Design an enzyme around this catalytic site. Structure first.
Site, PDB file in Angstrom:
ATOM      1  N   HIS A 145     -33.763  42.634 103.917  1.00 38.90           N
ATOM      2  CA  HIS A 145     -33.311  41.250 103.795  1.00 38.90           C
ATOM      3  C   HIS A 145     -34.063  40.535 102.682  1.00 38.90           C
ATOM      4  O   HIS A 145     -33.686  39.438 102.270  1.00 38.90           O
ATOM      5  CB  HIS A 145     -33.512  40.516 105.117  1.00 38.90           C
ATOM      6  N   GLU A 173      -8.368  64.808  71.905  1.00 37.21           N
ATOM      7  CA  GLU A 173      -9.205  65.456  72.904  1.00 37.21           C
ATOM      8  C   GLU A 173      -9.004  66.964  72.908  1.00 37.21           C
ATOM      9  O   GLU A 173      -9.875  67.716  73.332  1.00 37.21           O
ATOM     10  CB  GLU A 173      -8.935  64.865  74.293  1.00 37.21           C
ATOM     11  CG  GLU A 173      -7.467  64.699  74.655  1.00 37.21           C
ATOM     12  CD  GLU A 173      -7.266  63.870  75.922  1.00 37.21           C
ATOM     13  OE1 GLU A 173      -6.102  63.649  76.328  1.00 37.21           O
ATOM     14  OE2 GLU A 173      -8.276  63.432  76.515  1.00 37.21           O
ATOM     15  N   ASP A 232     -13.179  64.381  77.101  1.00 31.17           N
ATOM     16  CA  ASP A 232     -12.442  65.625  77.191  1.00 31.17           C
ATOM     17  C   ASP A 232     -12.593  66.517  75.950  1.00 31.17           C
ATOM     18  O   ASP A 232     -12.465  67.742  76.063  1.00 31.17           O
ATOM     19  CB  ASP A 232     -10.952  65.356  77.477  1.00 31.17           C
ATOM     20  CG  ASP A 232     -10.701  64.781  78.894  1.00 31.17           C
ATOM     21  OD1 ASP A 232     -11.535  64.982  79.811  1.00 31.17           O
ATOM     22  OD2 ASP A 232      -9.643  64.141  79.095  1.00 31.17           O
ATOM     23  N   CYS A 287     -13.233  56.016  72.635  1.00 30.56           N
ATOM     24  CA  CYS A 287     -13.350  55.416  73.955  1.00 30.56           C
ATOM     25  C   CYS A 287     -14.127  56.275  74.942  1.00 30.56           C
ATOM     26  O   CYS A 287     -14.268  55.912  76.106  1.00 30.56           O
ATOM     27  CB  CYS A 287     -11.961  55.103  74.524  1.00 30.56           C
ATOM     28  SG  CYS A 287     -10.793  56.483  74.512  1.00 30.56           S
TER      29      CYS A 287
END
Lengths: 551, 551
Positions: free
Chosen positions: A178, A412, A436, A483
């Site tokens: 907590h 890829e 990939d 990307c």
């Protein structure tokens, strides 16, 4: 000096608090002036009420609203005549002091209320016990905790809220949760002790646990102006350009998989979206997504980016995924089989709705469409022809369609890099999907542990294929983006810059740190790093070259 | 004119045979001169015996040995007194002619022998019935079949053997097997009819079914000198060099997977072994093969090739294969995982026995060792270091080890082609394993149907990677070979020649036809075909260019 130097930030240097519950022990005495004893009790009662009515109102007007209902309950208890009268009558008729009178009567209530086993009657007995403690403390003249560097025995997920988060600067080092929760939530410091209950007095600390010295109070003081310094100058780059120290410009886009990723795009200063993954529209459902449903999601993002480039990736999925509608056989090597563009070209009934929606959404922003898993030039031509087919269909139906939609492929498959120059003539852009490409070029499953050692993003082989794709697109006047995770990798960025990558696309939480790196770099120097990098033999040699040019 | 123009060669042009069993029907008459009738029977009996004793002896001294036991059985029947006497007694005492006397008595035997249901007593009744037919034919003066273009009603897998395979030239066109079997076995012609029983008379045919014309007997006559022409000039190249019309030399090696493939290597004129697959030593067993066992098989081949190059491929296998010893987990994409050199480097206990045996066998011939699935330069270095380690081990144990063992890699992982120039410095040679290179470069499972359309050996991407590997090895003074099916492909060969491939390795049954093609070609012209080929965009364009330069 304890441990657990985590859970939150560092460098606090403040006072203290010590939420240790004071000693409210008393001796059951006898009183002479009962009237005075009753006034004494009534005085603690009212003092407690104004105290609570202050805690309530000053909880809503800060950060409560729903946290301010326990105090109204605390207050409701004190207004209960069946509680007060018995106490007073005890003080008068029994001639005992208020402390015990309060305790005795409240105890009975606690007793009766807990033997009801209701989730609320136990809550009532908890309120009585909690407020009874407040009056009792007033009755005995004992100042108790109320709204600095907080420090306590345990970790109360309720007590640590009364204080104003403003003055509640510094940290909150307990003894073991907590505590570690709001530790990073309040963006404060922390530093899970044990014997911290015997640290500094009520006066006092320094999180980072040092407490005080008044000498080394300068080291941590400026070490704090080093922590906030970085975090500040970093977010300041939110609107800063992505330029190298010597004036070379590049674009830092974001990769998203849903319109819900939009807020993170803006708060990180992305200059566009380099990869809009569209699997979310197809996965986890029993029917394929309609054209209209996809349209809404593409349009939302196109519009929200105000003319910034948005590169949508058509469906990139194969049999290794659920997909109830559609029937994809088992497959021994799915990553080498029926998937992505192969599936789409073979099943146009699932591809057309996506292309029609994209074409329709194109009028709301700067859209770029890229196809995944393209291995052959004929595959790109077939995809493009199908896009043009629905283009004509949409116009003959009255729909508006942007005429300048850039079409590219996500590089890829190695054969795609081997023929970069040919594709560079028919395609508008390339976007290297290194996740990939590394996998297929090293022939190592991106998800396999036993061969992860071959998944080498810095291997000369990978850098070379990346370079021939970029150079091939520039020669045709086009551009190349990336990307794959590599594009947001601090070790890869220096190399990609040198290689001449136009746009880097990554998770929003990486653009800032990446923009920082790009600014403190010389392209002319990075270009040289890359020429040598593609001449190395091993990944380790490539790494060594990067740590060298980025000292 | 029938059909079924297959099962064997073509162009026969010979006489005939017509194995149709003659009409041995007779009328049960009565005889006056029984003594003459008995002499008549005895005359057919003995004529049949000398006939059989001729068939027997002239079956062994040709192509029988074990086929000559049915006649001795046939002969044994005729010597049986319990068969002869009853016949004669019938002729004398019953005054009936020999034909019926023979038939009647032999029938009884056939009856009694078949009701015994023994696999041999039914064989005896079959011999009696078979030889009884021979005597009976002599008894009636009916010339029956015995040892041209054979033609018959059915397909006897026993009758078609009596005749001498020498004069048994031409074909054997029946009506539908036991016929189509020896059809291609005897390397004769065939051409499964139906109404062929009414073709030419007993004089007569032309297989290829034409029968005669005496006019078009020249067309097929020279069309035969066109069939034997090709087959002859082809095997004549068994010892011919593999040189292009303009003097460019290349080597045509064979791919084997066991020492038992050796005979086919020599009878096809291979100039060495470009791929000795070693999986047979590990697959289908419960224990790994010992060093000694592998040694024997490597040495056998090295020695049998008399100094010709023998390129052994170390274990190239992964979890998709049985392999009881060793424990390889399931794997989602085995072709992209724990296999070949990855498995060997990770489990040296399975690799060392193979390397020690190879090292030991190296002194018996010209051995080259190549590693499969190498993706990184460090993998080659680790394999080589391990080879050197056992090299030192073998010498410190007294074993002799050839010092000039060439070490190479089988190029199949794209990253390997991207770094051709680097590997070309540390490696002695390259051997392109196109079966897997096509697969990984096109990211399409060599065994998957749904994506076989992407398995494109003629795709410009494949040609380019092949070219950069070859050019990279030549620049370092090394050589490059190819053992993938492509190397034996008539469409690929012209291109590989132009690209400058040093050694082609293929199944033995392809070297001849390949050697033929290579000879009728101009390297200077093929080189030009390849320069344009690597500039195409599609496989179809590459094909079109090959049919053009090979008109």
């Amino acid at each position: 000096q304890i441990k657990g130097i985590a859970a939150s930030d560092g460098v606090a240097i403040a006072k203290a608090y010590l939420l240790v519950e004071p000693d409210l022990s008393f001796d059951n005495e006898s009183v002479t002036d009962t009237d005075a004893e009753v006034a004494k009790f009534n005085g603690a009662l009212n003092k407690s009420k104004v105290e609570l009515t202050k805690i309530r109102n000053n909880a809503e007007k800060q950060l409560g609203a729903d946290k301010a209902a326990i105090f109204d309950a605390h207050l409701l208890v004190l207004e209960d005549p069946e509680l007060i009268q018995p106490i007073e009558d005890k003080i008068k008729n029994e001639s005992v002091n208020a402390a015990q009178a309060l305790t005795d009567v409240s105890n009975q209530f606690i007793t009766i209320f807990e033997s009801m086993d209701n989730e609320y009657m136990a809550e009532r007995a908890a309120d009585i016990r909690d407020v009874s403690k407040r009056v009792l403390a007033h009755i005995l003249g004992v100042e108790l905790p109320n709204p600095v560097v907080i420090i306590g025995n345990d970790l109360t997920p309720s007590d640590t809220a009364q204080l104003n988060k403003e003055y509640v600067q510094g940290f909150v080092t307990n003894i073991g949760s907590h505590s570690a929760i709001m530790s990073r939530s309040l963006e404060i410091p922390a530093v899970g002790t044990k014997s911290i209950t015997e640290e500094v007095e009520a006066g006092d600390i320094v999180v980072d646990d040092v407490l005080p010295s008044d000498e080394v109070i300068a080291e941590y003081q400026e070490k704090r102006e080093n922590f906030f310094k970085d975090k500040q100058e970093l977010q300041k780059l939110r609107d800063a350009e992505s330029v190298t120290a010597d004036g070379h410009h590049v674009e830092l886009a974001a990769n998203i998989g849903t319109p819900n990723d939009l807020p993170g795009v803006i708060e990180n200063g992305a200059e566009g979206i380099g990869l809009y993954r569209t699997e979310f529209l197809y996965m986890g459902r029993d029917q394929m997504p309609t054209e209209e449903e996809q349209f809404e999601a593409y349009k939302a993002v196109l519009e929200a980016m105000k003319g910034k480039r948005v590169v949508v990736r058509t469906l990139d999925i194969g049999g290794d995924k659920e997909l109830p509608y559609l029937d994809l056989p088992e497959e021994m090597n799915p990553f080498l089989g029926y998937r992505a563009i192969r599936l789409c070209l073979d099943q146009p009934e699932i591809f057309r709705p996506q292309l029609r929606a994209l074409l329709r959404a194109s009028v709301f922003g700067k859209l770029n469409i890229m196809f995944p898993m393209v291995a052959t030039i004929q595959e790109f031509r077939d995809a493009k022809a199908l896009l043009e087919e629905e283009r004509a269909n949409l116009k003959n139906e009255g729909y508006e369609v942007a005429d300048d939609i850039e079409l590219g492929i996500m590089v890829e498959i190695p054969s795609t890099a081997a023929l970069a120059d040919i594709f560079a003539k028919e395609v508008d852009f390339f976007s290297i999907g290194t996740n990939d490409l590394i996998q297929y070029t090293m022939a190592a499953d991106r998800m396999s542990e036993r061969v992860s050692y071959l998944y080498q993003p810095y291997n000369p082989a990978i850098l070379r294929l990346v370079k021939q794709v970029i150079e091939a697109s520039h020669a045709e006047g086009k551009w190349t983006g990336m990307c794959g995770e590599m594009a947001g990798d601090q070790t890869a960025i220096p190399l990609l810059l040198g290689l001449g990558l136009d746009e880097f696309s990554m998770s929003a939480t990486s653009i800032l740190k990446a923009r920082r790196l790009i600014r403190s770099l010389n392209e002319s120097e990075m270009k040289e790093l890359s020429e040598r990098a593609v001449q190395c033999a091993t990944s380790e040699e490539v790494v060594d070259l990067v740590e060298e040019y980025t000292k």
